[PDB]
Write a protein that binds this ligand. Structure first.
Ligand SMILES: CSC/C=C(/NCc1c(COP(=O)(O)O)cnc(C)c1O)C(=O)O
Ligand SMILES: CSC/C=C(/NCc1c(COP(=O)(O)O)cnc(C)c1O)C(=O)O
Ligand SMILES: CSC/C=C(\NCc1c(COP(=O)(O)O)cnc(C)c1O)C(=O)O
Ligand code: MET
Lengths: 392, 392, 392, 396
């Protein structure tokens, strides 16, 4: 097996099948023609290998899918119009009324809304559990539990789950484990190699790396991915990725290892800085020895990532003023871009929650989240220092 | 009030607001920054204009949306990753368990599959009514009836619905009427002006015109579109259109009127030709007097369209020989491209129906569907001529 | 031999050669690899047929080139980064110091600048001559004359050249005739079929049709085009066209016929309107019976085009008022877009600053030129009408 | 305080763009438009003159291209930038504006093939005189200067043999005599070498190579003084080449420049390990890599380039015959021209990038027949070593 960087650049592509083109040509085409109608009819049956319509399958997208599967260590992949496209296409195809889903305690806002105000209003039972407390997860398992879905680390407090420990319990009771691996990427964490069945990404984030597309990835077994493609995507969401955006995603993926290395090194220095500052009340960063689940972090992630969450002593007022004072960091949702970003999740990413749900599921009101970018670390520190003075 | 072609080129855009740029700049960006966090909070709350995240809203998508709303005569538009994106996003937000939806007799494969094997399996009631028969429709209206959905003309037999007749009934019972206007386009038929509440398009087809993007549009009232954007798209499908694809779609729309004229002219000559041939049992083209619903087609559609359906005497076997001998037409699914396409809906586009579930909903044995393109008519006649000779 | 529109959609491409893709895939790639190095050495020698570097040759560019060659009735085509790309690459290849180039009396501004302040200052002789007047052209020929270069119609006064008469005179001295066919496009005029050796285009204009790319085309004999590719383009200009832009150009070419029909019908109407107005001293439009070269225009052009130039009685000040009053027409240089455009070169384009510094070649004082777009003619008429009233 | 210059990486991501000026878009929107319009026709008069700041036509200037231009200027440490359709578009647009019949250009001993061909068979045939000089030999350069000498033009390291020039030294001689110094900086990028900071007047790039980094576009850049870059914009590009960069391709180039520092770091680290491995090998006659002490101009490399780069040049014992068999055995490296891509490439200049040269012009101007050039990519170094190791086995 070649190394991660070699596969992120080369896997699934030989230039000699495409006129020698070093870069794969872009199949910006909705439909594909047939030499005979029996050949075309065989394609629709699955009996012959080929393409007919890009919503179902497209060669540019397939190469992206194969490459991402290789990177996650899984069998098959599916590319979609957004991260929400990944999650919704996936869960619509795996759940039906009366099924129960076990959720991580804290979730990305639109995932939470999808579950509670979307598929949960169509007869699917939901129950939130602390996926780091394996006793409690075991106790919450019923025979109607079909899916355990969580993020590790969680957006946005960085709460972790023991993935292999959860997978053990799901094997024991017969549930499908679905992990949102957006924050880490396959470069830092591979939930399929720890017993998960499916992983989902917002490829909008680190995998793209440059903030210029919206996209989603699903990786897992050929059996599960084929059902998500032919039902979730085809019929229930229609979240088709543009070949153009798929080509850019592949372009971004070729520097993933180099980007994550720099994201992680910048974030480590910044986290250590913030931990020594008088205005900071507390800080969640997996790379800090004070991180509650530091041991599990080093067990599961090869590096501590580029995301930091912290609270300021002065509460929401100080957080507002910290944020307005930033000149190099931009005030924006999203993450995993070259540009450093900051946000207040209660008023933004986690707006979809009520005040009561945020307090119950762990989204504080004075919390700020930083996506640490690829800028020079001295420039980012100088920006942060002066914003802390301004926060008071 | 400027004419249709004028609005298809200019509506919603003044070059003076974007540094004089004649063509609108492409906002290929996932996220948008805020000058203060208060500004950002306000964007999420809805109480101020601007942008935050392209899955919810993007200025390039907004121009397309506003422009499509003008063409259709609606208050608001929404752009999505595909036709199925538009349909599913619309229906996932309007319906809940115990609601009923009355459908047209014939539907596009994946719409049918979505309805019966997707949302239908989540506690929603389906019932199929002839939407030309107002007596039957009235007798199907239960107080659970929340939505009325149909194509007119229908894919692929060309069945018309009485849009003003249906809307009359729906206004009395408080039902929302949704019309898939893909085949006609706003240039030929505007269902909102005949009383529909929402129109959906596969913009993949005539609106793009060139077969290079997959895309969907929803147009209707502000209040319905706002709900479909903020629930269906945001939370339940994530069917986000690429700004790149939206700029290609806007580019296509700029020649819609000229393209539709030529599609219609070419298809008229070809339909009239196919009527006169001995190998043809029947034919469904709205611009022949022979067409069963000719009078209703003239009241809704300003021209008869680019699509022909027909049967050969010889049946399924003669279909194969005809299709396989076409040398200018291509054997492929889809429609509304510059290139002329030929399709066998049983094995291809309507494969999602079981054998003789096709026959319950009017999908014949030896039905060949043509999407007539923009090529020189004499070349299209010659090609069809020699193909009929080879089907003997 | 298939019709013009059929060739503009299909020529040189079969979907069976590229996985069935209806639309050709875009080779957005700088380099191409070789299976062995003997294969690679052959490619640079010209022995083996393949690809090595997009600046020299790219499959996406080749398809565009073959298609543009088919439309103009030429052996071969070359795609370049702009119309000036095409013109400069052509002339740098064909001329050396001491060679003379014979020039149409009026020329596009940058072509004039290139000839006079560029290649003319490297020892190449220039002479301007009326290319309608065969007596003076024959008298102007010298042994040094190697190239005869002109536009017909000539920007911006619509003056015409006798292409077949010029070619006949060129054949007697072995000189190469190069026609800028930008205004007409191959749909309206085909200078190669009237005896010219090479045609050049700003494909930026009508061929694109939508104002979103800059591109040049050269079409002519294989031997000439090979040399412009391997000398002009490769070494002397580096005016490489992006494959992405070449894909868009081909997308524009698919509606060239329909767009040109509409451009011309709109311009005929606006010309007939302006010819009768009291504010209008003089008008140049090939379709008007009063047009000085009406008979010659109709020998060479199948339709009279989308461009109009006219003179207002009030001179420079009236020109400004008219231009400033247009609400629908945009004040811009360029032509051939869906959007209607107006320029008033006496508010300074064609590079010159006073009366008498003007009018060596026919650029005047109250001359405004219109690129008549694809909008509804009643809207265009209304806009021109109110602008005429404001000009008084 | 605030008068400190931001770091290279910060400027490669941010310089010249505030999201506030474009509806908050984090990524600049792409101006894929040929033409721009005016609010009045007097405002239009001033934009072809140059009293008013603004836009009219993309072949002259465009907001997406201006951002790219200003950003590359910042990185090179020059006043202004220009974006063109290719490396050759940058070179030709520059030389067509600076030279006229009677002028002499002093040229580095070895040049990229199409640059050589442009000079000898192109602009040379239009009355411009040419002289080659070893630009590492400052005494020879001084001796070669004449009062008709107008431009000094060279690459450093040169394509394909890695020969170098003392840029600071050439600039000093040029200051004294009055010539304009133009350096093709393709190989190093502004991350490794900044010829304007050493005294050059203009730098040109094939941005097709490391700046893009991903092999999907063709593109050129010129950076220099405002006066010289304006002249090149309005004469070379506008009238003499028309080598206009697509705004789409300029957006991709900017996307690539955001990872230039990281990619270059990894190119150099990979090539260094690979060069040391090739130095130890029995099949290898010689090897030119600037990071080995055996490199003829080792101290000059160290003095001008902050890292040794991604390009290796070597020769096998067995000559051209052994080249053939080695290159045909590679399975991770690709056989192709170009360089500075994520994918590792191997080529053979005499039949490839330098085919424009005649056989005696290759022996003269330092281009051997058995020379094999490597552009070391971003793959895992153990995968690359293994591929080169098994390829040397089959070349025996
Ligand atoms: C409320 S707007 C902020 C969007 C952000 N996140 C998105 C996201 C998605 C969904 O992915 P798209 O569908 O690609 O966004 C899925 N999974 C995770 C862990 C995510 O963080 C944000 O973090 O700020
Ligand atoms: C025979 S095709 C090989 C392409 C290679 N070279 C490119 C190049 C250019 C020209 O730049 P575009 O015009 O952008 O290619 C200019 N200047 C330098 C120092 C270059 O290396 C090659 O080395 O293999
Ligand atoms: C399985 S092959 C599909 C190609 C065909 N139709 C699609 C279609 C859609 C769906 O739209 P996307 O989601 O944009 O394809 C919606 N509405 C209508 C009337 C449609 O015809 C076809 O061959 O008729
Ligand atoms: C730099 S002058 C540009 C003029 C414009 N391209 C025209 O067609 O007239």
């Amino acid at each position: 097996l070649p190394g991660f960087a070699t596969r992120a650049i080369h896997h699934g592509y030989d230039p000699q099948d495409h006129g020698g083109a070093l870069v794969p040509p872009v199949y910006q085409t909705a439909t594909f023609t047939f030499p005979t109608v029996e050949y075309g009819a065989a394609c629709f049956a699955g009996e012959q290998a080929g393409h007919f319509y890009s919503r179902i399958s497209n060669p540019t997208l397939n190469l992206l899918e194969a490459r991402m599967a290789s990177l996650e260590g899984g069998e098959a992949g599916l590319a979609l119009a957004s991260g929400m496209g990944a999650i919704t296409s996936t869960l619509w195809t795996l759940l039906r009324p009366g099924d129960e889903v076990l959720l991580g305690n804290t979730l990305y806002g639109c995932t939470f809304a999808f579950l509670h105000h979307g598929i949960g209003e169509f007869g699917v039972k939901l129950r939130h559990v602390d996926m780091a407390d394996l006793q409690a997860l075991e106790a919450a398992m019923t025979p109607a539990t079909r899916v355990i879905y969580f993020e590790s680390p969680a957006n946005p407090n960085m709460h972790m789950a023991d993935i292999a420990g959860v997978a053990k319990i799901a094997r024991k009771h017969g549930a499908t484990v679905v992990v949102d691996n957006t924050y880490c990427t396959p470069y830092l964490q591979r939930p399929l190699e720890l017993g998960a069945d499916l992983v989902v990404h917002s490829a909008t984030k680190y995998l793209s790396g440059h903030g210029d597309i919206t996209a989603g990835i699903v990786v897992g077994s050929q059996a599960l991915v084929d059902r998500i493609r032919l039902q979730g995507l085809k019929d229930m969401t229609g979240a088709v990725l543009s070949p153009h955006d798929a080509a850019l995603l592949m372009r971004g993926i070729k520097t993933l290892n180099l980007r994550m290395d720099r994201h992680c090194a910048n974030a480590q220095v910044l986290a250590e800085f913030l931990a020594r500052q008088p205005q900071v009340e507390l800080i969640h960063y997996p790379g800090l020895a004070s991180f509650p689940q530091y041991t599990l972090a080093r067990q599961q992630m090869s590096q501590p990532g580029g995301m930091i969450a912290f609270e300021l002593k002065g509460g929401i007022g100080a957080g507002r003023r910290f944020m307005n004072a930033l000149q190099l960091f931009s005030r924006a949702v999203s993450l995993g871009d070259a540009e450093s970003l900051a946000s207040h999740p209660a008023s933004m990413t986690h707006s979809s929650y009520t005040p009561e749900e945020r307090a119950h599921y762990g989204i504080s009101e004075g919390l700020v989240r930083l996506s640490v970018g690829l800028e020079d670390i001295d420039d980012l520190l100088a920006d942060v220092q002066q914003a802390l003075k301004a926060s008071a």
